[PDB]
Amino acid sequence: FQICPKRCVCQILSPNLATLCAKKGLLFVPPNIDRRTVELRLADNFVTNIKRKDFANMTSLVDLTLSRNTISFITPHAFADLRNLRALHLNSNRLTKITNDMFSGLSNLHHLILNNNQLTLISSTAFDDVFALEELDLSYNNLETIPWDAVEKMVSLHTLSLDHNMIDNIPKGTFSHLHKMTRLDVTSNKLQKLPPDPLALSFGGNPLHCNCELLWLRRLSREDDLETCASPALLTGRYFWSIPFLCEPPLITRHTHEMRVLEGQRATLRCKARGDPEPAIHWISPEGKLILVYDNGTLDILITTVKDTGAFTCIASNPAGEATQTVDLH
Amino acid sequence: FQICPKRCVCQILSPNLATLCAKKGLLFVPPNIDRRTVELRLADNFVTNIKRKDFANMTSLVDLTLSRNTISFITPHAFADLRNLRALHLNSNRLTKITNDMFSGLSNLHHLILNNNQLTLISSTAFDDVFALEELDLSYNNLETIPWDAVEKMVSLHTLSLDHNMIDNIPKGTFSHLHKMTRLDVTSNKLQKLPPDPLALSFGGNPLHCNCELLWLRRLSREDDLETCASPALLTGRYFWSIPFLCEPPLITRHTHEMRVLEGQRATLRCKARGDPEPAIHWISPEGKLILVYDNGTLDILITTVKDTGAFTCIASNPAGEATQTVDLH
């Protein structure tokens, strides 16, 4: 009568004790859960908040189920004492953000399931303690990015599911360190490009920008999962097609009218250049390169020192090539 | 070759023409869809935006499927020309709000399916044109309220699914006008009370406040769907239990210290009263009731006219009874 809460069913076999509370119409975690429990099933319930005291001394706890719940909040160090937790199920809940201290102390955690959650953000340090992970399920969320750097340190990781979210891009470093990697799912995300990395990848629901940039993936010999394009004259055609897949090199449409300038003025020289992909505007002083500047492609430096009031050159550049245009100063 | 888009399969039987585009990896609605189509299947695709021009002259269109898509936006009058649409599937998408002009002109619409969407708000007039509805599926959303008034005018409505959302309350008028009503699902919502209305209702995932207020539902003879309480000493017990289910009548814990007042001052007299449910604070002038006031339970009137500077009475009241306390003015 003491080892099992009145709402729960639970069985003992040899050393192991399981606690089964799934589909009990529970509103919170029963506190009478024996701290010797190895298995905890709390799925199909209605818990909204995880207090600290809920899993205070579950040293023996290996598997936890909190699937299909109404969870919106988890106390900062609720999972801290779970040094043995191998798998944690938090799928089908109402969590909006993964906090920094949420998954602290989960060194043995190999399976993290957070699919079907309303996730927008993840605090960067959130995945620093779960470095052991084999499976990371972040599908069916509103994510634009995940802590990519923290992931590079999951060296035993084999599945990273990111399907049905809004991921803009994947950094080029990516999974170089993850050698045991098997599956990567990026279907149904707002992705225009994919980084040229050395290769099971699924990416069929993305608004692909088909440039000479996404050519490496076209050159590859893989199955058609109905990938479709959103580039200029390719806005509808199924991706796996004829390679003419061409870029528009940089071209300076607008440039600063030749100006004499004045002493003691923060001179602004705008450089407009069109291309596919958008060119990187770089600035050059008369006989010397520059490193202030603006993302758009404009230069601004205070007092306009007469020491360097010569021919200023603006360089537009993308993989298709370069473009040059000069602007006066006297 | 003209009646069917190249990505779609479609069949003709007698007068009826169906267009089948499900699971085609589409990013937008093909414009080459024949305006004679009676059935349109676009489920299992990746459309984000519904342009006006997509369904411009689908006079014959009866059923539309846009299930399992990435839809975040639908142009204000996209469905206006669908005078024959009987059912519309918008489940499993990324819509956040139902706008005023979204479902305009859907007079024949009997089935509106919007489950599994990230819905927060609904503009009040949104359901004014869909008065014919038989089925309204708003499950698996983030809703706190729906246009209840607009619903009262769905007199042929038989199913209203509101499960797995965050509904705070249901107005007391409710479904008096809806006589053909069969099922109401309010499971897994943040509901403390249910209005005493004349009776298939499911409500098993709510943080019930068990007062003498929710007694009518306890007195009823219905099946246990594992309903649980969150009242003072009943915070865990399964709802279907012993009726002692008691209220705490109103009691004025704090009251305004007897004051003489001054001429030309906006006199503020606070009246604090505790109860279960919270009492309604009402004010009474010496020999005359009042109708300014504050929600908390405070009175404030400018210039403090000497005409009524007598004994002011404060009344706290809930279903369990009344409470009285006097405050001076001279």
From Swiss-Prot, chains A, B:
Q: Which residues lie on this side of the membrane: Extracellular?
A: 2-330
Task: Spell out the residue ranges that the record assigns to LRR repeats.
Answer: 36-57, 60-81, 84-105, 108-129, 132-153, 156-177, 180-199
Q: Which residues form the LRRCT domain?
A: 206-249
What cystine pairs are annotated? 271-314
Q: Which residues are glycosylated?
A: 57, 296
Q: Where in the cell is it found?
A: Membrane
Report where it is expressed, by tissue: Predominantly expressed in the brain, with a weak, but broad expression in the cerebral cortex and diencephalic nuclei. Strongly expressed in both the pyramidal layer and the dentate gyrus of the hippocampus. Also detected in other parts of the central nervous system, including the olfactory bulb, pons, cerebellum, and medulla oblongata, as well as in the peripheral nervous system, such as the ganglia of cranial nerves and the dorsal root ganglion during gestation.
Q: What residue stretches are annotated with the LRRNT domain?
A: 2-35
Q: How is it modified after translation?
A: Glycosylated.
Q: Where is the Ig-like domain?
A: 250-330
Q: State the family named in the UniProt similarity comment for this chain.
A: Belongs to the LRFN family.
Job of this protein: Cell adhesion molecule that mediates homophilic cell-cell adhesion in a Ca(2+)-independent manner. Promotes neurite outgrowth in hippocampal neurons.
Q: Fill in the subunit field for this protein.
A: Can form heteromeric complexes with LRFN1, LRFN2, LRFN3 and LFRN4. Able to form homomeric complexes across cell junctions, between adjacent cells. Does not interact with DLG1, DLG2 or DLG3. Does not interact with DLG4.
**What does the UniProt entry state concerning the protein's domains?**
Lacks a cytoplasmic PDZ-binding motif, which has been implicated in function of related LRFN proteins.
Q: What is this protein called?
A: Leucine-rich repeat and fibronectin type-III domain-containing protein 5
Say which species the protein is native to: Mus musculus
Give the fragment's position in the full-length protein: 18 to 373 of 719
